[PDB]
Amino acid sequence: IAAQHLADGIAASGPAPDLAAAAAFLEMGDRLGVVAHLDPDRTLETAEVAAALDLPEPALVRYLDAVESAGLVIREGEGRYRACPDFDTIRHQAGYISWTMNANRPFIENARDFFTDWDKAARTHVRDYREVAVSSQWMGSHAFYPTALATIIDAAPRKVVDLGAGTCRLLIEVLGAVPGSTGVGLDFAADACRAAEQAVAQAGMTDRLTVVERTIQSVATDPGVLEGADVIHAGFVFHDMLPEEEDVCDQVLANCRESLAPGGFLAITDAVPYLRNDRERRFSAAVSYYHGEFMRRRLQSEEEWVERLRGAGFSDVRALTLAFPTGRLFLAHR
Amino acid sequence: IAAQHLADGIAASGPAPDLAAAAAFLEMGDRLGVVAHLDPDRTLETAEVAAALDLPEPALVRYLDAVESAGLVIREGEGRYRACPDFDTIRHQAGYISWTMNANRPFIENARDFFTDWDKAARTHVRDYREVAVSSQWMGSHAFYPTALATIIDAAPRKVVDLGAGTCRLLIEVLGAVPGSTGVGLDFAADACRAAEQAVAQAGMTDRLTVVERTIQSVATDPGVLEGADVIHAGFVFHDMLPEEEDVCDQVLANCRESLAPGGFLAITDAVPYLRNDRERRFSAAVSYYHGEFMRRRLQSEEEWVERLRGAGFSDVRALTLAFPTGRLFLAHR
Ligand SMILES: CSC[C@H]1O[C@@H](n2cnc3c(N)ncnc32)[C@H](O)[C@@H]1O
Ligand SMILES: CSC[C@H]1O[C@@H](n2cnc3c(N)ncnc32)[C@H](O)[C@@H]1O
Ligand SMILES: CC(C)CC(=O)C(=O)O
Ligand SMILES: CC(C)CC(=O)C(=O)O
Ligand SMILES: [Zn+2]
Ligand SMILES: [Zn+2]
């Protein structure tokens, strides 16, 4: 009796109000720099963080008080705030919403332009690659990054190479797990290389781990840095050179197979296109439509990837379903 | 055994991949004009809709095929598409994400400016009121609009007034339910008034329902149009004149009480600030922080609203919890 309208509405909205609010608070706070100071295991001290971020302290305090009202942080004492116990899961979920609604917003808002003159639209409406990187890392935290770590650590490698390694977090975490091991982080971006180069410094791995600043294409002609590696990792990278650079790509793959030490494998995480199964189909379709229609980059099915890795001379290929919908981890044994 | 990593990841992501993908597809499609042609009870014919929307048909077909892969539409025949059975619930959930991440995106991206010089930020970073209106209507579909309808229809009114009525859908639906009834839709926006004025035309209610183009403030001095109404409705409107126009507002409220026919009531849906209960607190906080910090509009608690309505001379005030988190429906009896 109008308690019906209420219960019916609650069931229809489900978790969407909570998620919409978490994602907006967390994107806003991350753009401010605040989210990197929130952690379930310690407090953020407003007086210091406001100074470190060059923000007015009363403004920062009203933000953290709003986030405290939302249940995302806990006010421990006066001027001190702690993230809620399940913050990292909430931030992981926010990553999916940030990626489709923020990182890829130029495609949402400008689809008509992309439909009528793609070449002009592709250069006019461009994605903010800081947002692409942050939301990808939030999604990866629980849905593909752990699986890649464990696989690399368990191979107990001596040399590990990462193509498109960014700030080299994955290499730093692997080297800190195999006490005797070396790493190579390859990235063609200047600022990415500069931050990876000092994060490795502050971990003391400045000798065990070098930060080469080249393209993955450059590997096709200079495969020297790949020599003798036990594991080569590429995360969501190889698709970005298809179909315009299929030969260069086929030849980087062939280079990787020859450069592998005995018993070594190339680990590729990438997205497969348009899955039909009920769990993955909806996010699969967004990942595929964004890549196929707006970025014009070719995503390959498992069948195509196995084909392509066989043709590069790998002797066996194992595909693993990742929790990230349409994410697959291909392990290509030499 | 690495089937653990998979099940753990799936539990951590929960419904977020599905929601993120639905919201992006549906905002993109709505901006294109396509979503208004999707319905669970009939098909969209691509050849005709592509022409009506001035879109290349192959482009429209790739979009609908992507949305079909996502499970949001069904391809009935060749060139014909039907929305999935629960489309309206999915679109309702997408409304929360659209509102926090799209409609209010100027606040997410520019919080630093709002913190350091508000007056300059408020006029530089402005919300797209087409996006505000669409996402509000998607949220309202299952979470506040039904409760307001049923209350108005059940009062069996002779005259109904709506302050900030937009395209007058709510009035059209009420007049089509009380066979003998009149309505007044008040809105100060030119284009809103022009569309309400022809939607009422195509319903034949062009006589029973007039579309006055004034401000709700203008009611404070010209209360004539309010005369004799059985029900006055205002949806998410009165807060937008607090605190800068408290006297004008207090006097519109007093005007409404005096203009009511005997047995009549004023129905106000509005948002209360920063609730603490577990269901509503997170979205409550986003609604409140957006209004308090970025729009500088005053949201009142239930206690304050009842106070304010008593002081305007209403004899009894009933507050109803809406499914929309922090939404409240206040019924103020004359
Ligand atoms: C994990 S995919 C994106 C990351 O990998 C880097 N990257 C993207 N494309 C390439 C490329 N062709 N070669 C080397 N690094 C790349 C980018 O600088 C970013 O850090
Ligand atoms: C339901 S809140 C927004 C809708 O109500 C209208 N509206 C907003 N503010 C006012 C106002 N002061 N007076 C009259 N209509 C308003 C807007 O034109 C829009 O259609
Ligand atoms: C995790 C990936 C899907 C990220 C990506 O492919 C991109 O945004 O470019
Ligand atoms: C449904 C309302 C919360 C919409 C609103 O207040 C706004 O965006 O201005
Ligand atoms: Zn990509
Ligand atoms: Zn508002």
Residue numbers in the entry:
A (entry chain A), B (entry chain A): 6 to 339
Paper lines:
SgvM is found in the biosynthetic gene cluster of the antibiotic viridogrisein and catalyzes methyl transfer to the C3 (i.e., β) position of α-ketoleucine (4-methyl-2-oxovalerate). The overall structure consists of a two-domain fold that assembles into homodimer in both the solution and the crystal. The N-terminal domain (I6 through H147) consists of helices that mediate dimerization, while the C-terminal domain (F149 through H338) consists of a Rossman fold. A single metal ion is located at the base of the C-terminal domain and is ligated by H244 and H296.
